[PDB]
Write a protein that binds this ligand. Structure first.
Ligand SMILES: Nc1ccn([C@@H]2O[C@H](COP(=O)(O)OP(=O)(O)OP(=O)(O)O)[C@@H](O)[C@H]2O)c(=O)n1
Ligand SMILES: Nc1ccn([C@@H]2O[C@H](COP(=O)(O)OP(=O)(O)OP(=O)(O)O)[C@@H](O)[C@H]2O)c(=O)n1
Ligand SMILES: O=c1ccn([C@@H]2O[C@H](COP(=O)(O)OP(=O)(O)OP(=O)(O)O)[C@@H](O)[C@H]2O)c(=O)[nH]1
Ligand SMILES: O=c1ccn([C@@H]2O[C@H](COP(=O)(O)OP(=O)(O)OP(=O)(O)O)[C@@H](O)[C@H]2O)c(=O)[nH]1
Ligand SMILES: O=C(O)C[C@H](NC(=O)CP(=O)(O)O)C(=O)O
Ligand SMILES: O=C(O)C[C@H](NC(=O)CP(=O)(O)O)C(=O)O
Ligand SMILES: O=C(O)C[C@H](NC(=O)CP(=O)(O)O)C(=O)O
Ligand SMILES: [Mg+2]
Ligand SMILES: [Mg+2]
Ligand SMILES: [Zn+2]
Ligand SMILES: [Zn+2]
Lengths: 147, 310, 147, 310, 310
C-alpha cells in the first residue's frame, strides 16, 4: 500500500473524492498530536477514486461517525486494534448537526450569543434540509456554511 | 400535574392538538368563573425587547386578574443589556433567580428558545421572537375562531398580507394544521410568500392549500379572513416594494361573504383593513384582541398551577 | 515508510508540526485529481516531529516555494523523477511577497482598493521584517500572519 | 532632462541627497528671480481628500505663480467617489487623462503610491498620505533650515510632540539622515514615540539620536527645535490620554537657547507653542510656511520641465 | 456664425445630426491641433448642485486649455441658495450678469431648461439634470464611437443596466437615432427599463430595438457595449431591489465578442464591470472619459466663438 497499515486507531475508508480535505477542515481532525496518514485521489474498484484518512490512537463514537453521513454517506469507518479490524460501521444520517455549521439567517439569535449552533436534519426530496434549533428556519444543506 | 405545568411555551411546533384544546378549555372556564387569587404569590417577569401594545398589556392584565405581581421592562434601552453590553444569556440567568415565569418578546428569531437554555426551572413564554413564532397569538386566535365558527376543524381559512415575516401566521397555520380537514388560501405578494417549511408541513399532512392573487376569488367560501400587517421592521431594503399593503379590505368587498365569516387581524393594522369594515358584522379583530385576556390567563394558570382549573 | 515512495512529483519534507495542514489550505494543494499522500505528526531525526506532503506529477510555482520560507524555513522541497530525487533544496527568503499577505495597518489603502498586497522582506535575527509597499510600515512576519 | 523630470514624488525614502539639493538650489533661484510663465499651458489637479490650509493653498499659489492652471477639489464629498461609490483607483484613472500632474493628500497611508499605479505618464506629488509621508513639507523644511543655519550637516535637531503619527517628522528625519553628522533629539510621549523603522534607519547609518522627557534638557544645544501637533484625527481611542500637548513651548523657555536657534512647526499649532513665542527672534514657523511657495514652485518646475536655466 | 454660436445646450432632442457632426469634427481638429487662447478673456461658471468627478473636472480643464477663466461651485451648500433660501431662478439671474456661459449640473429634471429662462443672453450648457438629459456625455460618447468604429451608422449598440434613470442613455439613444440603420439592444431589469418615450421615438423612426435578459445573447453581434451604473440616488425606495448590478461584465464574457467591439461606460462603475475587464482590448471607458476633453472644448469653442478656422 502507498499508505501503510496502523496498529491502533480509526481508518475512514471510501471517502468520495474532494471530500477528504473537507472532512479534515470541518471536524478539525488534524488538531491533535496523534499520527495521521492521508491519501487523496486513490484508485478504488468500488468507487473509482477515493480519499482515505487514518488517525492513530483515536476512536469515533456512533454519533461522530454519523456526522460524516452528510459528506461521505457511503464511507467505511474501521476501528483498528493490534493491527486488526475489530469493527466496521457505515455512517447513518444523524438527527442533528451541532457546532460546526453557521445559521444563514442573519437575524438568528445564535450569531450574537454564547450558544452552539444546532440544526435538525431531514431528507427533503433528494436534498438534505437543515432546520435551525433557534430560529426554526429551514435551509438546504448547500447554503448552510461552516465556521 | 396538568400536561402544561412548568412547560416552556416557545413554538406551536412543540405543542400538540391536546395542548391547544387544554388551553382553550381552561380559557372558557376562567372566563365563566374568574379565579382572582389563583396565582397569588407568583411574581412574573414581562420582558419586552421590541414594541408591543396588545401582547404586553393583555399578558400583564391577565397576571393581575389572577392575583400575580409583575416586574420587567417594555424597552431594553435601560437594562444592563441595553447600556452595559450584557448578553441575553446573562440577562436570563439573573432574572430567572427572581421570578416564577418569564414572558419575553424579542427582535431576533430564537431568543425565547435561547432563554430556556439559561432559565433553569423557570418557564419561558414566547411573546414573539423576530419573524419566527407567536404562540400566544395563536392561542387567542384559535379561541376566537372557535367562538365564532363553533369548531376548529373543516374550516376554510384565508391568510392575507406578509406571510413570510408574520410570526402570527407561522404559528396559526401550524396550529390549525393539527386539526382535521382545514383548507388554506394564501394571498401574499410573491416576495412575502408563506415559507416553504410551512407548506411542506401542510403537504405531509395531506392538507389542501392554494395561492390566490385576490381576496375576491375566495370571499364566497372563506369562514375566516385573517388579515396581516406588512412587517416593515423585518423587511430587507430589497423588499421595500412591499411596504405598502397590497390587499386592502373595505366594506364593499364583503357583499358575497358568508354570514358566519369573521375578519380577523392580530393587529396593529395600517390600511389593510379600511375603517368602514369596523361597523360591519364581519369585523371581529377587536373582539379577537379582547380574547387575549382569556387565552393568556389560561396559559398562565396551566403553566404556573399544578392542578387543572375546573 | 508509512507513506511510500512516488514516481514523479514533489515531496515537501521537514514541515513543522501543525503547519502541514495549513499548507494544504493556503496552496490549494488538494484541489487537483493528482494522487496525494500526507503524513502528519511523523517522528523525525532532526525535528522530533514533522509533517510531510507528497504530490504526484505536480510541482510548486515559484514564490509559492518562497512563501514556504515564511511558513516553514526548515522545510525540504524534493523534486522527484523516475523514483529518484533530482532536485533538493530549502526555500530561501525572497525579497518580495505579493498577493497572499494582508497589511496589519488598518489605515492602509491596500484594504479599501483593488490592488495586490506587496511586502519587502528582510531578517532582523529574531524575526522577519515585512514592509508594505503602500503604507511603508514594517512589521514582524509574526504579526502579518494573522491575515 | 533634470533627474526629477516626470518623476512621482511620493516618499523621501525614494529621493537622494542630490535630488533634495537640486530642489533647494532651484527654490533659491526662483525666490530670487521668478519665472511667471514657466508652466504656461500646464493644467494641474489639486486633489485633497482631507483638510489642508498651507499645503493646498501654497501648492495652488505656486502653480499660478508659474503660470499653470488648476482644477481639483478640497473635499471628496462631492466627487463621484464621495457620492456614487467610485474607487480611488478609477478616480485617478480618469483624472490622469485630463491633467499634466496630480497633487494629492489623502487620509490613508499609501494612497499616493497607489495613485502612481493608475496615473500612467502623469506624475503624482504626495501632499500627505495618512501618517506616512509628507515629502513637500520636508522640502520646505530643509529649505528653511538651510536658509537659517547655512547648512544641512552637523546640526542639532530636536523633534517634539507626536512623532508616531507625524508624517512631517517621518519625511524630515529620513531627509536629514541623508546628510552628514546630524544629531537628533526625540521628545515625545511614550505612546507617540518616533517609530522603530525610523530609529533603525538612523542606527544603520551610524547617526546619534536620543530620547528626552523635556525640552529644557536640550534647549542649550539645539539649532532647530521642530514642534509638532498631536495628530488627534489619527489617534486610536486607546491613545486619547495624549490628545493635549504634553510639551508646551513658552517664551520663557528660550532663555538659554543658542542665538541662531530657530523654532519650526509645520502647523497648525494648537497649544504646543504659546503665542508669546511669536515675537521672539526664534519663532520661524510663519517664515517656514512662506517658504512652501519656493519649495513647491521648485518641485513643480523640475517635474514638469526637462531643463531649467535659472 | 456657426450654427451653435450662443446656443443653449440642454437636450439632444433640440440638436440635429449636423449639429452633432459639427461638434465631432471640431473635437477632432482641437485634439489634433490645440488652440490655447481660443477663449481668452472669457469667464465661465461651473455650477454643480450634485456630485461629479469627470463632468466637472473635464469641463474646467477644457476651459483652461482654451484659455478661459472659471468660477463656480461643486457644492450648493455654501451658496446663498444653500443657506439663505434663494431660488435657482434668482441664482441664475445674478450669475448671468457675471459670466459668458454657465455650465450646470442639478439633481432636478428641467433645471437647465429653467436656467435658460433667467440667463438672458448667457448660454447654458446642461451638465446633467436629474435623470433627464446629459448632452455633453453624448457628445463625447459619439466621438468615442466614431473614433473606434469609423462610423455612426449601421451600428449594433447594446445598452445595459439602469436605462430608466440613465440620463446618459436617454441622450445617447436620441443622438444615435438621428443617424441611419442603427440597431439597439436594451438589457435592463424590468423596473429600470428604457422609458416609453424613448422607445416610441425609435418606433416613429423605424429603428429596430429589442429587449434581452443577458449580455451573452448579443455579445457576438455588438459593436458598442454601453454599460451603466444603477442610479441609486434616483431610485424610489420601492425600487431598492434593483440597487445591486444585475448584469456583471467579466473578462471571460468577452470570448465571442467582435474584435472591434468596445466596452463603454460613462462612469463611475460600481460592480457592473469587473476590474479584470480593464486589461482586455475591449475596455475603452477610460479612453472614453479622456475624450470628454476634446468634446467639451469643441462645444465651448462653438458656443462662444462665431467662427473657427481649424
Ligand atoms: N492495521 C490496519 C488494518 C487495516 N487498515 C485499513 O483499513 C481499511 C479496511 O480494512 P480491511 O477490512 O482489512 O480492508 P477491506 O476488506 O477492503 O474492507 P472493505 O471491504 O470494507 O473495503 C483498509 O483501507 C486498510 O488499509 C489499516 O489502515 N491498518
Ligand atoms: N521516490 C521517492 C524518493 C524519496 N522520497 C522522499 O523524499 C524525501 C527526501 O528524499 P531522500 O533524500 O531520499 O531522503 P533523505 O536522505 O533522508 O533526505 P534528507 O536529508 O532531506 O532528510 C524522503 O522523505 C523520502 O521519503 C519519496 O517519497 N519518493
Ligand atoms: O490503507 C490503505 C488502503 C488503500 N490504499 C491504496 O488505495 C488503493 C486500494 O487499496 P485497497 O486494497 O485498500 O482497496 P480495495 O481493494 O479494498 O478496494 P476499495 O474497498 O477501496 O473499493 C491502492 O492504491 C492502495 O495503495 C492505501 O495506500 N492504504
Ligand atoms: O516518505 C516518508 C518519509 C518518512 N516517513 C516516516 O517518517 C519517519 C522518519 O523517517 P525518515 O527516514 O524519513 O527520517 P530521517 O531519518 O530522514 O530523519 P529526518 O530527515 O526526518 O530528520 C518514519 O517514521 C517514517 O515512517 C514516511 O512514512 N514516509
Ligand atoms: O405586529 C404584527 O403585525 C402582528 C403581531 N401583533 C401583536 O402581537 C400585537 P402587539 O404588537 O400590540 O403586542 C406581532 O407579531 O407582533
Ligand atoms: O497637520 C499637521 O499637524 C502637520 C502637517 N500640516 C500641514 O501640512 C499644514 P496644512 O494641513 O494646513 O496643509 C500635516 O501632516 O498635515
Ligand atoms: O452617474 C452616472 O452613473 C452616469 C453619469 N456620470 C458622469 O457624468 C460622470 P461624473 O458624475 O463623474 O461627472 C451621470 O449621469 O452623472
Ligand atoms: Mg476495501
Ligand atoms: Mg531524511
Ligand atoms: Zn437560526
Ligand atoms: Zn500597508
Amino acid at each position: 500500500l502507498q499508505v501503510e497499515a496502523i496498529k491502533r486507531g480509526t481508518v475512514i475508508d471510501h471517502i468520495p473524492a474532494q471530500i477528504g480535505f473537507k472532512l479534515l477542515s470541518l471536524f478539525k481532525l488534524t488538531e491533535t498530536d496523534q499520527r495521521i496518514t492521508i491519501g487523496l485521489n486513490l484508485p478504488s474498484g468500488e468507487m473509482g477514486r477515493k480519499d482515505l484518512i487514518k488517525i492513530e490512537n483515536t476512536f469515533l463514537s456512533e454519533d461522530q461517525v454519523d456526522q460524516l453521513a452528510l459528506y461521505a454517506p457511503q464511507a467505511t469507518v474501521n476501528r483498528i486494534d493490534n493491527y486488526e479490524v475489530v469493527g466496521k460501521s457505515r455512517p447513518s444520517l444523524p438527527e442533528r448537526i451541532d457546532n460546526v455549521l453557521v445559521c444563514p439567517n442573519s437575524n438568528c439569535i445564535s450569531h450574537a450569543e454564547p450558544v452552539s449552533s444546532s440544526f435538525a436534519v431531514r431528507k427533503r426530496a433528494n436534498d438534505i434540509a437543515l432546520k435551525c434549533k433557534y430560529c426554526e428556519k429551514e435551509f438546504s444543506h448547500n447554503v448552510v456554511l461552516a465556521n | 400535574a396538568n400536561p402544561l405545568y412548568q412547560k416552556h411555551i416557545i413554538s406551536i411546533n412543540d405543542l400538540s392538538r391536546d395542548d391547544l384544546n387544554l388551553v382553550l378549555a381552561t380559557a372558557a372556564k376562567l372566563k365563566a368563573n374568574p379565579q382572582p387569587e389563583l396565582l397569588k404569590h407568583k411574581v412574573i417577569a414581562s420582558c419586552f425587547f421590541e414594541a408591543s401594545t396588545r401582547t404586553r398589556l393583555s399578558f400583564e392584565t391577565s397576571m393581575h386578574r389572577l392575583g400575580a405581581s409583575v416586574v420587567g421592562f417594555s424597552d431594553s434601552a435601560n437594562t444592563s443589556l441595553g447600556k452595559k453590553g450584557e448578553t441575553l444569556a446573562d440577562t436570563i440567568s439573573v432574572i430567572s433567580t427572581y421570578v416564577d415565569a418569564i414572558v419575553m418578546r424579542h427582535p431576533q428569531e430564537g431568543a425565547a428558545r435561547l432563554a430556556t437554555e439559561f432559565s433553569g426551572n423557570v418557564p419561558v413564554l414566547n411573546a414573539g421572537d423576530g419573524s419566527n413564532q407567536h404562540p400566544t397569538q395563536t392561542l387567542l386566535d384559535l379561541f376566537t375562531i372557535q367562538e365564532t365558527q363553533g369548531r376548529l376543524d373543516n374550516l376554510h381559512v384565508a391568510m392575507v398580507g406578509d406571510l413570510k415575516y408574520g410570526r402570527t401566521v407561522h404559528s396559526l397555520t401550524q396550529a390549525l394544521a393539527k386539526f382535521d380537514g382545514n383548507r388554506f388560501y394564501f394571498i401574499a405578494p410573491d416576495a412575502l410568500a408563506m415559507p416553504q417549511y410551512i407548506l411542506d408541513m401542510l403537504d405531509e399532512k395531506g392538507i389542501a392549500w392554494s395561492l390566490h392573487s385576490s381576496i375576491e376569488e375566495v370571499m364566497a367560501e372563506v369562514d375566516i379572513l385573517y388579515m396581516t400587517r406588512v412587517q416593515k421592521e423585518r423587511l430587507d431594503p430589497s423588499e421595500y416594494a412591499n411596504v405598502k399593503a397590497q390587499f386592502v379590505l373595505r366594506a364593499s368587498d364583503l357583499h358575497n361573504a358568508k354570514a358566519n365569516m369573521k375578519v380577523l387581524h392580530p393587529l396593529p393594522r395600517v390600511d389593510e383593513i379600511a375603517t368602514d369594515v369596523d361597523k360591519t358584522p364581519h369585523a371581529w379583530y377587536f373582539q379577537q384582541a379582547g380574547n387575549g385576556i382569556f387565552a393568556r390567563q389560561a396559559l398562565l394558570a396551566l403553566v404556573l398551577n399544578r392542578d387543572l382549573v375546573l
